[PDB]
Amino acid sequence: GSSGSSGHKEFAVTMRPTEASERCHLRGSYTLRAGESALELWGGPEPGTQLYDWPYRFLRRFGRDKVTFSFEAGRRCVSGEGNFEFETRQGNEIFLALEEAISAQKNSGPSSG
Numbered sequence: 001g002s003s004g005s006s007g008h009k010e011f012a013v014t015m016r017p018t019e020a021s022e023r024c025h026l027r028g029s030y031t032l033r034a035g036e037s038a039l040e041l042w043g044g045p046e047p048g049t050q051l052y053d054w055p056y057r058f059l060r061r062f063g064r065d066k067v068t069f070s071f072e073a074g075r076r077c078v079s080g081e082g083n084f085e086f087e088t089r090q091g092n093e094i095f096l097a098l099e100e101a102i103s104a105q106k107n108s109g110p111s112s113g
């Protein structure tokens with residue numbers, strides 16, 4: 001942390017109406033976070049655990065919109081395939097974070113122990 005902050009950057013999002021969300025039958029607002037290998041999303045009671053963490057590798061494509069941030073989830077996922085939408089303005093960050101990791105894992109050689 002020579003510049004300022006490396007990680008630990010969460011983003012408040014709201015469950016919006018979507019074909020996918022429907023199946024999930026979600027309600028309320030959850031927390032959005034970007035991990036190293038997969039995505040992070042807390043919801044349960046404190047402290048909390050990652051249950052919606054989607055594996056980037058699977059994420060074929062994704063897009064961020066100042067108005068709303070969404071992405072395309074593949075198959076064989078906890079939540080399921082479809083298009084999820086998150087209510088946030090700083091979405092720009094959320095996206096970048098993902099790329100940062102996807103690029104990092106490669107930036108450095110093969111992680112061993």
